[PDB]
A paper describes a structure:
The first step of adenoviral replication involves the interaction of the fibre protein and more precisely the globular trimeric knob with an attachment receptor from the host cell. Desmoglein 2 ([name]), a newly identified adenovirus receptor has been reported to be used by some species B human adenoviruses including HAd3, HAd7, HAd11 and HAd14 for cell infection. The intermediate portion of the [name] ectodomain, consisting of EC2 and EC3, has been described as important for recognition by the HAd3 knob (HAd3K), the trimeric globular distal part of the fibre protein. Here, we report the structure of HAd3 fibre knob (HAd3K) in complex with one and two molecules of the [name] receptor.
A second minor complex harboring two receptors per trimeric fibre knob was also found. Different population of particles with either one or two EC2-EC3 modules (HAd3K/EC2-EC3 and HAd3K/(EC2-EC3)2) were identifiable in agreement with the 5.40S and 7.34S species previously reported. Their 3D structures were solved to an overall resolution of 3.5 and 3.8 Å, respectively. In the 2:1 complex ([name]: trimeric knob), the interactions of the 1:1 complex are preserved, with the second DSG domain EC3 interacting with the G–H loop of monomer ‘A’ and the EC2 domain interacting with the A–B and C–D loop and N-terminal portion of the D strand of monomer ‘C’. In the 7.34S complex, one of the two EC2-EC3 modules is bound similarly to the corresponding one of the 5.40S complex. However, the relative positions of the modules differ slightly in the two cryo-EM maps (rmsd of 2.585 Å between the two EC2-EC3 modules) likely due to the binding of the second module in the 7.34S species. The main difference relies on three extra glutamates (E146-E268-E299) from HAd3K, which might be involved in the second module interaction while they do not participate to the first EC2-EC3 module binding. In the present structure, however, the interaction surfaces are different and the 1:1 and 1:2 binding modes are largely dictated by steric hindrance occurring close to the three-fold axis of the HAd3K, likely resulting in less favorable binding of two EC2-EC3 modules binding and extensive clashes if a third EC2-EC3 module is present. The structural data confirm the biochemical data since clashes occur with three modules excluding the more commonly observed three-receptor per knob binding mode observed for other HAd-receptor complexes. In addition, the non-classical stoichiometry of the HAd3K-DSG complex (1:1 and 1:2) results in non-symmetrical binding of the receptor to the trimeric knob.
Numbering used by the authors:
A (entry chain C): 130 to 219, 225 to 239, 245 to 318
B (entry chain E): 108 to 134, 146 to 193, 206 to 224, 228 to 233, 238 to 291, 299 to 331
C (entry chain B): 130 to 219, 225 to 241, 245 to 318
D (entry chain A): 130 to 218, 225 to 239, 245 to 318
E (entry chain D): 108 to 135, 146 to 194, 206 to 224, 228 to 291, 297 to 331
Write the structure that this text describes.
């Protein structure tokens, strides 16, 4: 096995409104080992009312954070994914980003930038700037690996007037893993 | 059920990232925002145990609203948060002068930030044509005007317009500097 | 063996201009299985006159369909790639896009799309940006097929990228999707 | 063995100061086998004064050229990498294909991407990266050619001071040789 | 040791690729070294100390910010190099209308459109070319570029209501690869009334 799943069509497991106590958005995140790197797949689907009424605004920054431990499981008390990451065919430290090439500490060799697109309901296409930040920080003492995701959007015209569902284009990226 | 003060104040940066500390109200107390005066976006999230107002996943804009007055109950009071403007909104220029130390032209511009501050003042540089040394600049701050004055008595040139301070981290790496031409006549 | 080929530089197999039986373009399509996903590699090369005279205009769109079958081969009667795909060291059910993550709908739906950007280097060295809209299943042509994978290259330029005829070669586009076990 | 490393965090092994004999800039280049293709990871960090003071200017074109021989060991005399790649534990399979990217117009030897530069205060400047596969020949003993070109034109300067030239990790995928 | 000339006049083009050959200076074992440039703060040129060649380097050039360079070299066991930057086409001509015609007038002037192109004055990269968009279908107006101060003067053809139209701007020579696929044609219109 070399695939850290989340689910091909998972239920609600991620919170976006910071302060809720029931999960309200689905997050699809697939990591695969490939030689000396890890390839990634990540998308986010809003499955509530407030997240679906996010893109009536013109400047929106969506943050999703993940805090693994030394073994490599999500601590759901302090993370932002409220469901553990499971394998496919069966210790899961092999999919986590390296603390040799992205050390803890300025020091902007940690970030990985990129883009996705939001397909609006009136046929419009808007670009979302994705910032994937690696380790960079320690929120706790028991936290051993950090991986955060950010979807930034600034637009002149407003993207949506009525509420539609929130759906982003998939994102693909690669990072150096811990052995 | 009892507060400590009556009128709270605070300051949050314009176009800041999510989950930043705005202010820390005080009065187990479950802090409860009940109304905003601009009410349609929830821009502020109140941590219920400690009274720390945070900026949630939707971000602000000073040019739509500069003062948020929200009423909060601690189980009444006011909260009056002001927005500090950062330098987005590149200036735009709405330009002929004839000579015979006589001032030549008057250049009127239009920014969009807080009026009076150092993110509003148009600072005027030189692009192509003052190698003869003919024009010295002056930024009339009280009405934001680009006065020029003669240097060497006796041709056209161009001006690149920017703000007084440096731009924000978002509008930079998009600003393409476009030169703007001034035609000077001589008798 | 975990590579669904088309050829590193094959002959003309794809067809645009529906209403024609001559294969008029070349299409390198490589789908590599990797863990629980499939990585891809798409390159469209011009191989006739009609594909090469497309970029004399400015708002153009090049469409390619791939309608698979129930077991993982390409039906040539309905798709636009009239040449079956092969392995590297010769059933291809493993390389198909997943129907539990990209499900079939029937009346909008926008969770089974992939957006990307490639570039067209013109005859004098000017890069033009093309948009790629890789659409997975989303629809069904008829009852014979079982999976749908379409590609689409759009360009809305300001001026004409060419005036004479040159070989329309696009930059290689890379993408990834979830496969059907 | 399916990885051509550079080290996870190396010392300086490239040369951008045109006319120096010692290396002055580090780059991480990782190539991995994946079926019929090879995935690639590349980033470039400056390590001297001239490389760090490149981005005080508007237009900057950084050029890194690699010349693999018949086997696949990098010639450290005519390339820009002055230190060859190593395996994780020959190296013909990681080299690009010759029946897909042939030598000599012929605009099929290119892969165009995009990466970013985080500025001194941080402003996300877009760098346009171009990976030219083989297309050329220095002499009659190099067999495979790769070239990365990091181009930047900008409205204003990225930074008015010297900080560090750290570019974003760029990812690509090419057809490999058997 | 000694040199063979005193003014090695050569040239290179604006926005060129890195490590193009500017010129090859010469002297009658020798080693070459630049001792001064005219601008001290941008290092733009590189002196090949083996064969005496001038290359451009990883930071490329712009003619509009500094037009001509003068730089002094000196060889060991001085002389001046005078490099003029040849201008290539770049940034789009920008436009800043009304006019009046009369009954059955032939070849009369309506407007003289001004245009500020930031390129080299006199060459083919500053001379604007004005093409029509919509309104000149039936053979109404003709356009010429007066090359004294780059004026897109229009004139009548036939003998003639609110027949306004629009013009599209371009240079006389075609654009570079670094500015095309960003030039979007914005036709700024022209209004004209008959009397």
């Amino acid at each position: 096995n070399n695939t850290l799943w989340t689910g091909p069509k998972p239920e609600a497991n991620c919170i976006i409104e910071y302060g809720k106590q029931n999960p309200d958005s689905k997050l699809t995140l697939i990591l695969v080992k490939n030689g000396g790197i890890v390839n990634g797949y990540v998308t986010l689907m809003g499955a509530s009312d407030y997240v679906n009424t996010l893109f009536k605004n013109k400047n929106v920054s969506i943050n999703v954070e993940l805090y693994f431990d030394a073994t490599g499981h999500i601590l759901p008390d302090s993370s932002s994914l409220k469901t553990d990451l499971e394998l496919k065919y069966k210790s899961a430290r092999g999919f986590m980003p390296s603390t040799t090439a992205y050390p803890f500490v300025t020091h902007n060799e940690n970030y990985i930038f990129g883009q996705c697109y939001y397909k609006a309901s009136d046929g419009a296409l808007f670009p979302l700037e994705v910032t994937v930040m690696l380790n960079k920080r320690l929120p706790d003492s028991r936290t051993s690996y950090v991986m955060t995701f950010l979807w930034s959007l600034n637009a002149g015209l407003a993207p949506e007037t009525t509420q539609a569902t929130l759906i982003t284009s998939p994102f693909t990226f690669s990072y150096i893993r811990e052995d | 059920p009892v507060f400590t003060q009556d009128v709270f104040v605070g300051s949050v940066e314009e176009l800041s990232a999510a989950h930043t500390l705005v202010m820390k109200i005080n009065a187990k107390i479950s802090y409860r925002i009940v109304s905003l005066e601009p009410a349609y976006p929830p821009v502020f999230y109140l941590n219920k145990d400690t009274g720390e107002i945070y900026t949630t996943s939707v971000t602000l804009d000073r040019e739509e609203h500069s003062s948020y007055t929200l009423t909060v109950e601690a189980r009444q009071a006011q909260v009056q948060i002001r927005i500090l403007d950062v330098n987005d909104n590149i200036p735009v220029v709405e330009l002929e002068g004839m000579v015979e130390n006589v001032e030549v032209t008057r250049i009127k511009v239009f920014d969009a930030d807080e009026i009076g501050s150092d993110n509003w003042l148009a600072n005027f540089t030189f692009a192509s044509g003052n190698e003869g040394g003919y024009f010295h600049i002056e930024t009339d701050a009280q009405t934001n005007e680009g006065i020029v004055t003669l240097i060497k008595e006796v041709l056209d040139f161009s001006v690149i317009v920017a703000n007084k301070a440096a731009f924000h981290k978002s509008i930079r790496s998009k600003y393409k500097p476009t030169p703007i031409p001034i035609k000077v006549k001589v008798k």
